[PDB]
Amino acid sequence: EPLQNEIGEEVFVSPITGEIHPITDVPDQVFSGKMMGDGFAILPSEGIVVSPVRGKILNVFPTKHAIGLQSDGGREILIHFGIDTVSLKGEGFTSFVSEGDRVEPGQKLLEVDLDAVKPNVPSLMTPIVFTNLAEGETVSIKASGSVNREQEDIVKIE
Amino acid sequence: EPLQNEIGEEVFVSPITGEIHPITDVPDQVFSGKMMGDGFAILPSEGIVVSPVRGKILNVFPTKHAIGLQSDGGREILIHFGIDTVSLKGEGFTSFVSEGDRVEPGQKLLEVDLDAVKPNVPSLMTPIVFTNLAEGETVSIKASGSVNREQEDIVKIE
């Protein structure tokens, strides 16, 4: 099951193209305060979201702006596109996966019409939250600046 | 420390006047899906928020729309006023407490100008989330219909 790289780490690829930020930069304390878990964020420049891991879809929000996944290695991840986006009721969001789907890295999960979304939210910053980390595990960003969808080795869980 | 009633339960009073709802009725899956914890919600009819317990303030969000508290008995509670309210940047919210303050039931924590807020959010539904419940503890609503600030015995942790 678990997909591991040449260093025997589980593969974790950038799910979105844009700029990588520490989780402390999300301008919403539910996320910067790590209330659901540690993680990182990406300010997107394209509105396509792809799977960062080989794993399974656990939950697709009704508004299609956030997706929950679990990697073959057991980490649960939530990707929530944008800040305060449930207000949009789904408008501008398309889903390409269903709950229980099995996904491979780079497989498309969602597509966002940024021009329809941008004007209506306070920030397009998108948190990537690890929701079941072990006691003592922290997230660290390895990449810096712009990242592209499918780029590996962008963060580390230490 | 712990404040207990005639049944030896820790005192938990309604922090807001309005209508009590199960946590499944909040129209935002981060909350209805219990991602930060189990709880309940109130649809406010007045914009005053008071302490539901004797305890301590842990965190006052910068926008002043959500407050984190811990009861003398050790339960951590987050009260987040409204849905997608960080977008308002604080406008319409007044705070009357600081982090580390000690609070008594009914003590005022916040005041919200509903008319300034209502038009700008998708719902005024306010979740009350218990963020450190034990393995197996669930929240149950006892009250039904309208509740007023300071009314006891509105929910049960079983």
UniProtKB/Swiss-Prot annotation, chains A, B:
Induction: Strongly induced by growth on glucose and glucosamine.
Domain PTS EIIA type-1: 28-132
Disruption phenotype: Deletion of the gene reduces the growth rate on glucose but has no significant effect on growth on glucosamine. The gamP-ptsG double mutant grows slower on glucosamine. Deletion of the gene negatively influences the growth of the cells with maltose, N-acetylglucosamine, sucrose and trehalose.
Active site per database record: 80
Subcellular location: Cell membrane
Domain notes: The EIIC domain type-1 forms the PTS system translocation channel and contains the specific substrate-binding site.
Function: The phosphoenolpyruvate-dependent sugar phosphotransferase system (sugar PTS), a major carbohydrate active transport system, catalyzes the phosphorylation of incoming sugar substrates concomitantly with their translocation across the cell membrane. This system is involved in glucose transport. The system can also transport glucosamine. In addition, plays an important role in the phosphorylation of EIIA-deficient PTS transporters. The EIIA domain can transfer a phosphoryl group to EIIA-deficient PTS transporters, enabling growth with maltose, N-acetylglucosamine, sucrose or trehalose as the sole carbon source.
The protein, known as: PTS system glucose-specific EIICBA component
